[PDB]
Design a protein around this ligand. Structure first.
Ligand SMILES: *[C@@H]1O[C@H](CO[C@@H]2O[C@@H](C)[C@@H](O)[C@@H](O)[C@@H]2O)[C@@H](O[C@@H]2O[C@H](CO)[C@@H](O[C@@H]3O[C@H](CO[C@H]4O[C@H](CO[C@H]5O[C@H](CO)[C@@H](O)[C@H](O)[C@@H]5O)[C@@H](O)[C@H](O)[C@@H]4O)[C@@H](O)[C@H](O[C@H]4O[C@H](CO)[C@@H](O)[C@H](O)[C@@H]4O[C@@H]4O[C@H](CO)[C@@H](O)[C@H](O)[C@H]4NC(C)=O)[C@@H]3O)[C@H](O)[C@H]2NC(C)=O)[C@H](O)[C@H]1NC(C)=O
Ligand SMILES: *[C@@H]1O[C@H](CO)[C@@H](O[C@@H]2O[C@H](CO)[C@@H](O[C@@H]3O[C@H](CO[C@H]4O[C@H](CO[C@H]5O[C@H](CO)[C@@H](O)[C@H](O)[C@@H]5O)[C@@H](O)[C@H](O)[C@@H]4O)[C@@H](O)[C@H](O[C@H]4O[C@H](CO)[C@@H](O)[C@H](O[C@H]5O[C@H](CO)[C@@H](O)[C@H](O)[C@@H]5O)[C@@H]4O)[C@@H]3O)[C@H](O)[C@H]2NC(C)=O)[C@H](O)[C@H]1NC(C)=O
Ligand SMILES: *[C@@H]1O[C@H](CO)[C@@H](O[C@@H]2O[C@H](CO)[C@@H](O[C@@H]3O[C@H](CO[C@H]4O[C@H](CO[C@H]5O[C@H](CO)[C@@H](O)[C@H](O)[C@@H]5O)[C@@H](O)[C@H](O[C@H]5O[C@H](CO)[C@@H](O)[C@H](O)[C@@H]5O)[C@@H]4O)[C@@H](O)[C@H](O[C@H]4O[C@H](CO)[C@@H](O)[C@H](O)[C@@H]4O)[C@@H]3O)[C@H](O)[C@H]2NC(C)=O)[C@H](O)[C@H]1NC(C)=O
Ligand SMILES: *[C@@H]1O[C@H](CO)[C@@H](O[C@@H]2O[C@H](CO)[C@@H](O[C@@H]3O[C@H](CO[C@H]4O[C@H](CO[C@H]5O[C@H](CO)[C@@H](O)[C@H](O)[C@@H]5O)[C@@H](O)[C@H](O)[C@@H]4O)[C@@H](O)[C@H](O[C@H]4O[C@H](CO)[C@@H](O)[C@H](O)[C@@H]4O)[C@@H]3O)[C@H](O)[C@H]2NC(C)=O)[C@H](O)[C@H]1NC(C)=O
Ligand SMILES: *[C@@H]1O[C@H](CO[C@@H]2O[C@@H](C)[C@@H](O)[C@@H](O)[C@@H]2O)[C@@H](O[C@@H]2O[C@H](CO)[C@@H](O[C@@H]3O[C@H](CO[C@H]4O[C@H](CO)[C@@H](O)[C@H](O)[C@@H]4O)[C@@H](O)[C@H](O)[C@@H]3O)[C@H](O)[C@H]2NC(C)=O)[C@H](O)[C@H]1NC(C)=O
Ligand SMILES: *[C@@H]1O[C@H](CO)[C@@H](O[C@@H]2O[C@H](CO)[C@@H](O[C@@H]3O[C@H](CO)[C@@H](O)[C@H](O)[C@@H]3O)[C@H](O)[C@H]2NC(C)=O)[C@H](O)[C@H]1NC(C)=O
Ligand SMILES: *[C@@H]1O[C@H](CO)[C@@H](O[C@@H]2O[C@H](CO)[C@@H](O[C@@H]3O[C@H](CO)[C@@H](O)[C@H](O)[C@@H]3O)[C@H](O)[C@H]2NC(C)=O)[C@H](O)[C@H]1NC(C)=O
Ligand SMILES: *[C@@H]1O[C@H](CO)[C@@H](O[C@@H]2O[C@H](CO)[C@@H](O[C@@H]3O[C@H](CO)[C@@H](O)[C@H](O)[C@@H]3O)[C@H](O)[C@H]2NC(C)=O)[C@H](O)[C@H]1NC(C)=O
Ligand SMILES: *[C@@H]1O[C@H](CO)[C@@H](O[C@@H]2O[C@H](CO)[C@@H](O[C@@H]3O[C@H](CO)[C@@H](O)[C@H](O)[C@@H]3O)[C@H](O)[C@H]2NC(C)=O)[C@H](O)[C@H]1NC(C)=O
Ligand SMILES: *[C@@H]1O[C@H](CO)[C@@H](O[C@@H]2O[C@H](CO)[C@@H](O)[C@H](O)[C@H]2NC(C)=O)[C@H](O)[C@H]1NC(C)=O
Ligand SMILES: *[C@@H]1O[C@H](CO)[C@@H](O)[C@H](O)[C@H]1NC(C)=O
Ligand SMILES: *[C@@H]1O[C@H](CO)[C@@H](O)[C@H](O)[C@H]1NC(C)=O
Ligand SMILES: *[C@@H]1O[C@H](CO)[C@@H](O)[C@H](O)[C@H]1NC(C)=O
Lengths: 134, 452, 41
């Protein structure tokens, strides 16, 4: 459980400790640490540190437009379409690893993302027009 | 119905991909010796605490002959070799008509030449003659009094390696960048490449050293069981075969020549370090192998090849048929100078169907080299003044085809290490990096506030 | 023996050995070369 401890465990047990996975990835790699410094290792270190933040910030930009700036688990007001999966409540959470589930939505994973921005943020932050001051 | 979708940041899923890595080595030599050709002058130091986590219930499919970690390793060492040779003395005014004669053998094997030439001195106006020595095959005849020629001047340039550069391989960890992880296989019998059931997610690899060897790997890693056999393709005899030793055979190589550093200033500051007169007799270089310890290793290999290769055919172990003297002999850099010990003596044994003597091998030394068939630029190896000994563990073997035998029986694998990338595969057969995707959507009745 | 625009020129250069020199005849184009000061050099 020190890192990816529940990679093979159930999606429910993996959902119990998903903080750990998030903590190590951005921070990890110990990047922090003749006269030249133009060596082949330093240039592989810098670009490896650039995608470090540019893959982190690629994901953190998505949660910000979903109301999840500082939450590891948002429940979003987007209804689930039956075409994406036909399995019941306890059918997936007590049976599949997150690995199996990632390939089962990888086909229509982009369709979900586009709809998440519309109802949870594009409309929700607008619904306060009549409720902010009245 | 009435089920909502929910977002999860921190999910453990990944997809097979490869990106850039980096070096990791702790405090090794620094002051007592420095200017290493591999660890450069400074690399990212590894932490003494090993980053390891055992993965359970997971069975990710690795690949070794399609793994891109060996590809980045192959290309990293190449660009690293040239980076450590660009700021060193070039040897261009060393291509002048050489007039040599055979060494003093009491008017009676030869292998070396007491040669001379004239070069540039500190003043471009003046010239100077100096007598040095060279090795055979480093020079080939032109057309009385023998007049010779450096073999490289015919094809490519030349630049002497720096004298204070250490050519000893030290452990260089390859650790994954942020948002990625190197999966190592913990299953002992990892035949070929398939689904390894026992997986560990480690951030830094183990102490991997860039042993530049040929036919016979040295200082490799292994973790028990029968001597493992790995092949990209077992049915195709044409493909190369990597072999791993359940236990290493302690070998010793050395040259008995007692040489002397003869520095001669070419141009303003540069100095060409050549061989002087050899003091205290002349002898041939050799590598010893434990004869009793080798007969057990060739027996364990043929045993596990048996159930792999029909277990009915005849074993035919021969010398590396064909090839070049540098690609068929056990070529390796040790102690500064580059050895090429004669392999043909080891594989003479044939075993089929059911204080102590040690076999030795004749070896010669070469100073002009441009390894892995890189024809761009060659380098001269300064003779290391004094004594030389190698004494390394051998842990791997590289064996190649056995002709186009049409059915019938009778065949084995004679040694060939035509490719340098395969040498690094003996350490990276279990490693594969994956692109971690921390985003994962899943449904559950669950919604936040209605209006906000 | 009779437009010109090009020259059948020669010279001697460095060979594989800095001790030895070699003559080779090549060709060049006009305007790539302009006169210095019989036999044209
Ligand atoms: C590998 O190859 C290298 C390179 O050798 C190359 O070819 C040889 C022929 C020589 O020309 C080299 O210069 C050249 O680079 C070998 O290294 C050389 O080996 C040779 C082997 O013969 C050595 O030659 C001996 O040198 C003795 C000393 O000479 C040195 O100093 C000379 C000037 O000094 C003067 O004053 C000193 C005292 O202060 C005197 O001792 C000296 O004689 C001079 O008067 C300088 O010109 C030399 O180059 C050298 O630096 C010299 O005494 C020896 O000659 C004697 O004795 C020989 C037998 O030992 C005999 O065979 C010779 O015929 C000769 O007899 C007569 O001696 C008279 C003394 O006055 C002389 O006047 C006569 O002319 C002479 N007879 C005739 C005619 O020849 C040798 O000449 C040489 O020193 C080595 N290199 C150096 C340091 O220059 C190397 O050994 C080879 N490998 C191996 C391991 O074999
Ligand atoms: C596969 O793995 C194997 C593992 O064995 C690798 O094989 C060999 O493993 C050996 C393990 O000991 C390595 O041995 C080391 O050798 C170096 C050699 O450096 C000497 O020469 C340097 C340059 O020459 C100068 O000095 C000499 C006089 O020696 C002189 O003639 C020259 O003109 C010139 O001035 C020197 O800088 C260096 O000091 C040394 O003389 C050696 O340095 C290592 O030293 C350790 O062991 C020695 C002997 O027991 C001991 O004295 C050392 O003690 C301390 O004090 C000395 C003297 O001041 C100091 O230099 C040291 O730093 C220490 O403070 C020390 O314990 C060691 O012997 C070997 O390099 C390695 N490689 C070879 C050649 O095979 C194998 O390489 C791997 N795979 C393959 C095939 O690559
Ligand atoms: C790395 O090292 C290896 C070490 O093996 C080296 O391999 C060498 O490869 C070269 C070229 O390929 C070989 O070169 C020649 O081999 C000749 C063959 O022998 C003839 O004459 C025989 C009599 O020789 C005696 O010794 C041989 C062993 O060489 C032995 O088999 C014989 O029984 C005999 O005792 C003759 O018998 C033989 O054929 C008859 O007998 C055999 C065996 O019973 C039978 O099967 C046949 O049907 C037939 O009846 C054959 O006709 C050899 O003659 C030749 O030179 C020899 O004589 C000269 C002159 O005196 C010596 O100087 C020299 O040392 C030899 O004794 C030459 O050797 C060579 O044999 C291989 N191995 C060595 C070194 O012996 C690799 O090339 C090396 N790699 C590199 C980088 O070079
Ligand atoms: C490791 O890699 C190796 C790569 O070789 C994989 O090895 C496989 O080995 C088997 C051994 O039987 C091969 O089987 C045959 O290969 C033939 C190669 O085709 C050559 O000839 C073709 C045509 O040329 C002329 O000669 C042929 C001779 O049969 C005539 O039939 C033809 O009329 C011509 O006159 C060329 O087009 C081609 O480029 C080659 O030069 C195949 O021809 C042969 O086909 C037979 O079987 C087929 C499959 O059942 C069938 O569909 C055909 O009709 C025919 O009956 C047959 O495939 C494999 O080819 C070879 N693989 C590869 C990549 O070629 C090895 O499998 C792998 N590792 C493993 C998994 O162990
Ligand atoms: C994820 O989605 C992909 C592709 O689907 C696309 O993307 C999604 C989001 C939708 O927009 C779809 O409309 C898109 O098409 C699926 O890929 C399928 O993979 C399989 C296996 O590789 C493909 O099967 C092929 O079958 C060929 C033979 O056809 C046979 O049947 C036809 C029809 O009767 C017949 O005409 C023919 O003669 C044959 O009898 C075969 O040659 C080929 O090699 C291959 O096996 C299939 O075509 C792909 N999908 C489509 C519709 O193109 C993934 O399976 C899916 N995964 C999950 C988990 O859902
Ligand atoms: C660089 O070395 C070369 C040789 O590789 C020098 O060229 C000539 O080499 C010959 C070899 O015998 C020298 O021999 C001398 O010949 C003369 C006349 O035949 C003879 O009288 C002498 O006793 C001696 O045998 C010769 O000195 C040398 N030069 C000439 C003019 O032929 C070359 O000169 C050396 N340095 C350079 C590049 O100038
Ligand atoms: C490691 O061992 C496994 C078995 O546990 C090997 O997998 C099996 O290998 C055989 C022989 O390579 C395959 O049979 C052959 O398949 C080829 C096509 O690849 C076909 O052309 C031949 O006619 C023959 O059927 C077999 O399919 C394969 N898989 C299974 C499930 O048995 C594996 O090859 C060994 N090597 C590795 C991966 O290191
Ligand atoms: C490799 O060759 C060198 C150089 O010849 C050897 O070094 C020499 O070793 C001897 C051992 O006794 C040293 O001792 C004595 O020196 C005196 C005074 O010069 C001399 O008269 C004696 O005959 C004896 O040589 C010697 O000083 C030393 N260096 C020299 C300049 O010869 C070395 O021993 C040889 N191989 C190895 C590493 O053992
Ligand atoms: C490189 O080429 C040049 C010419 O550009 C060489 O210089 C001299 O060029 C002349 C041109 O006629 C050569 O002619 C010879 O002259 C002699 C004496 O006058 C005569 O007897 C011959 O029949 C012939 O006409 C000459 O060989 C050549 N050298 C000399 C010593 O004058 C130059 O030598 C060539 N290579 C280098 C740089 O050494
Ligand atoms: C070499 O082959 C023999 C027989 O061909 C092996 O002995 C066993 O033979 C039976 C029946 O043919 C097989 O079912 C067994 O699998 C064979 N043993 C095993 C464990 O493979 C003999 O074992 C083979 N060589 C060795 C020593 O493994
Ligand atoms: C289980 O799945 C069916 C469709 O296969 C769906 O109609 C049903 O509503 C699901 N069960 C629940 C808990 O709603
Ligand atoms: C020197 O060795 C060469 C090697 O080919 C040989 O051709 C030559 O005859 C030898 N000369 C003498 C006199 O030993
Ligand atoms: C290598 O040298 C060591 C020194 O102790 C010796 O014990 C060993 O037997 C040697 N091995 C061989 C066969 O070269």
């Amino acid at each position: 459980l020190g890192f990816l401890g529940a990679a093979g465990s159930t999606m429910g047990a993996a959902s119990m400790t998903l903080t750990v996975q998030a903590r190590n990835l951005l921070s990890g790699i110990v990047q922090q640490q003749h006269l030249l410094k133009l060596t082949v290792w330093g240039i592989k270190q810098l670009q490896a540190r650039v995608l470090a933040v540019e893959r982190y910030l690629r994901d953190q930009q998505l949660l910000g437009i979903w109301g999840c700036s500082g939450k590891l688990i948002c429940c979003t007001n987007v209804p689930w379409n039956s075409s994406w999966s036909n399995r019941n409540l306890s059918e997936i959470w007590d049976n599949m690893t997150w690995l199996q589930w990632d390939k089962e939505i990888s086909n229509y994973t982009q369709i979900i993302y586009g709809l998440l921005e519309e109802s949870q943020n594009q409309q929700e932050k607008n619904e306060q027009d009549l409720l902010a001051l009245d | 119905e009435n089920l909502w979708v929910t977002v999860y940041y921190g999910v453990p899923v990944w997809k097979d991909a490869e990106t850039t890595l980096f070096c990791a080595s702790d405090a090794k030599a620094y002051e007592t010796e420095k200017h290493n050709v591999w660890a450069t002058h400074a690399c990212v130091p590894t932490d003494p605490n090993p980053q390891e986590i055992h993965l359970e219930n997971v069975t990710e499919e690795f690949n070794m002959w399609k793994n891109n970690m060996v590809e980045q390793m192959h290309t990293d060492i190449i660009s690293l070799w040239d980076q450590s040779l660009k700021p060193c003395v070039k040897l261009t005014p060393l291509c002048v008509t050489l007039q040599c004669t055979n060494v003093t053998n009491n008017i009676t094997r030869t292998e070396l030449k007491n040669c001379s030439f004239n070069m540039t001195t500190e003043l471009r106006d003046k010239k100077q003659k100096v007598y040095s020595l060279f090795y055979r095959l480093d020079v080939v005849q032109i057309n009385s009094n023998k007049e010779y020629r450096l073999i490289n001047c015919n094809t490519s340039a030349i630049t002497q390696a720096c004298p204070k550069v250490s050519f000893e391989p030290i452990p260089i960890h390859y650790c994954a960048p942020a948002g990625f992880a190197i999966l190592k296989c913990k299953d002992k019998k990892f035949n070929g490449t398939g689904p390894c059931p026992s997986v560990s997610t480690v951030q830094c690899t183990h102490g991997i050293k860039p042993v530049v060897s040929t036919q016979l790997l040295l200082n490799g890693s292994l973790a028990e069981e029968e001597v493992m056999i790995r092949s990209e393709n077992i049915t195709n005899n044409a493909k190369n075969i990597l072999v791993q030793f359940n236990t290493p055979v302690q070998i010793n190589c050395t040259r008995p020549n007692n040489n002397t550093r003869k520095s001669i200033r070419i141009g303003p500051g540069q100095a060409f370090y050549a061989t002087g007169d050899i003091i205290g007799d002349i002898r041939q270089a050799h590598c010893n192998v434990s004869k009793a310890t080798w007969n057990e290793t060739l027996g364990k290999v043929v045993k596990q090849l048996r159930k792999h290769f029909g277990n009915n055919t005849i074993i035919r172990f021969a010398n590396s048929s064909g090839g070049d003297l540098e690609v068929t002999t056990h070529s390796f850099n040790c102690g500064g100078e580059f050895f090429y010990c004669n392999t043909s003596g080891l594989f003479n044994s044939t075993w089929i169907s059911n204080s102590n003597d040690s076999i030795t091998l004749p070896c010669r030394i070469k100073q002009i080299i441009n390894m892995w068939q890189r024809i761009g630029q060659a380098m001269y190896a300064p003779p290391i003044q004094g004594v030389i000994r190698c004494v390394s563990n051998i842990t791997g073997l590289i064996l190649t085809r056995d002709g186009g035998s049409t059915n019938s029986t009778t065949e084995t694998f004679r040694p060939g290490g035509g490719d340098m990338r395969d040498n690094w595969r003996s350490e990276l057969y279990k490693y594969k990096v994956v692109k971690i995707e921390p985003l994962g959507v899943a449904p559950t009745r669950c919604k936040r506030r209605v209006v906000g």
